Amino acid sequence: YTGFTPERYNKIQFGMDRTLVWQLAGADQSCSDQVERIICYNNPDHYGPQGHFFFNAADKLIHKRQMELFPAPKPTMRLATYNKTQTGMTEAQFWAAVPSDTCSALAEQYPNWPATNGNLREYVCPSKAERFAPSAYFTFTDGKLTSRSQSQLP
């Protein structure tokens, strides 16, 4: 598979039919449909950059994820910064504790689309640029931090 780009990711919008997402992403040339999700690849390295898309029962888009398509520009995440986050904090509080440039916009979900309540907004904040590097993960539910975790961060 090949050809799934940032530009195609930015064309894909919530509420789009599975068939429309598939076509805009590059269809058979770019994507694999695994029922639970579609995975669309930048290039033939399946460990490389990719987008994942998930749908509700009406086959409308409710969840976008991306890995390495929009990388954190300056990955420098450390415990000192992780320690400044807490359950319940707002997005504004979070971005005052953690620099935006150390985090990638991992996922955006509207499970109840076309309703926008219960929005899930996820970030991965890597310690360095290397694939599989220790990173912190954060999830916001309607703008409040509901999960924070890290594995082996320095």
Query: Which positions touch its own copies (CB under 8 A)?
Result: 5-11, 13-17, 19-20, 23-24, 66, 70-71, 73, 91-92, 95, 100, 105, 108, 113-117, 119, 121
b/e burial code for range 52-88 (CB count within 10 A of at least 16 → b): bbbbbeeebbbbbbbbebeebeebebeeebbeebeee
Nearer to its own copies, 2 or 116 (CB): 116
Nearer to its own copies, 143 or 154 (CB): 143
In whole angstroms, the minimum distance from the beta carbon of 44 to its own copies comes to 19
Q: What angle do CA 103, 113, 23 make, to 5 degrees?
A: 75
Nearer to its own copies, 8 or 153 (CB): 8
In whole angstroms, the minimum distance from the beta carbon of 46 to its own copies comes to 22
In whole angstroms, the minimum distance from the beta carbon of 114 to its own copies comes to 5
Under DSSP, is residue 20 helix (H, G, I), strand (E, B) or coil?
helix
Nearer to its own copies, 47 or 95 (CB): 95
Q: How do beta strands 135-141 and 50-55 pair?
A: unpaired
Q: How do beta strands 104-109 and 144-150 pair?
A: unpaired
